[PDB]
């Protein structure tokens, strides 16, 4: 893995590590899942940890997490993120596609908010957010 990919994964890990102690527990996984509006059962949480918990100590450390992310690789996370917004794959995020993502992520929206989000990101003034504008907005 490149250090840049390891740094992205470290940031991904840190989205789950609520106490910052360098391990992801079932409760930390379930917390994030609940925040996404999922309702995981104890069984599903344990099953997801079990596959990634290489040393069987009951929690996921960063090397175990990194091994899972590396297996996935076999695009950059900001690229995959853009693809989630750009559902029809034309390289541009439209208002409808942004509405779709906000809806899927439980972000309440209004047309004006959506227009202003697009307008703020829209450097070339074409009414949509392309990848380069996307990444600049995320900086």
């Amino acid at each position: 893995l490149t250090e840049e990919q390891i740094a992205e994964f470290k940031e991904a890990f840190s989205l789950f590590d609520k106490d910052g102690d360098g391990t992801i527990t079932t409760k930390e996984l379930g917390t994030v899942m609940r925040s996404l509006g999922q309702n995981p059962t104890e069984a599903e949480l344990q099953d997801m940890i079990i596959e990634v918990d290489a040393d069987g100590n009951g929690t996921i450390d960063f090397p175990e997490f990194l091994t899972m992310m590396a297996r996935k690789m076999k695009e950059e996370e900001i690229r995959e993120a853009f693809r989630v917004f750009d559902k029809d794959g034309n390289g541009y995020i439209s208002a409808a596609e942004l509405r779709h993502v906000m809806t899927n992520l439980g972000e309440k929206l209004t047309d004006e908010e959506v227009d202003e989000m697009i307008r703020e990101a829209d450097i070339d003034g074409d009414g949509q957010v392309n990848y380069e504008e996307f990444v600049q907005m995320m900086t």
Partner: peptide, 25 residues
Amino acid sequence: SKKAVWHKLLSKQRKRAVVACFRMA
């Protein structure tokens, strides 16, 4: 400014994509 909303979507999407990775083993 709406940069915060954009950043919150990205954070959530990143979390959702890691959850999907756990689910896919």
